[PDB]
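A common beginner's mistake is to predict each chain separately and then try to dock the pieces by hand. The better habit, illustrated here, is to supply every component at once so that their relative placement is modeled jointly.
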Amino acid sequence: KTYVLKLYVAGNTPNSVRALKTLKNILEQEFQGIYALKVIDVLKNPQLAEEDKILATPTLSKILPPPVRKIIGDLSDRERVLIGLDLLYEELT
Amino acid sequence: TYVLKLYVAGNTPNSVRALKTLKNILEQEFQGIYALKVIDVLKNPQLAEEDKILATPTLSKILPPPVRKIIGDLSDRERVLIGLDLLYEE
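With all components supplied together, the output reads:
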């Protein structure tokens, strides 16, 4: 049973790619096995699949860890590439 | 009014033409019960508080026939449609 953190972005900028890498390592170092990360670029895969949804970053980021919330804030308020998020809690192989 | 919100990854002359038609058909058949709001995430990416994007296949089925068709076009032909929402507002 794992949390799948999904970030929906509108393209990438140099800082966003850097921020995402930082987010990845953080999850890997500080939360190994607790969060799986998935980044969906709507510029490459615009159509949401039937069971997908994009919710507002403010609402969902509230239960994420502080250092994760901070990078998400940058993707959102500074880089302006983060449209939203989805958070899943399901069994993963 | 219930606002049908269409979230798009940019526009094309064809998607823009289609969205105008959709707006007119809605106003024509439902006289104000429905309003169209287009959100271009390439322009305004951050979803605000109540904003949420649902898969087109989920909500599209409850919509007007000519509207489902255009949305099918925006989704499969233009490939600009990400998802949608229907929210009462005023």
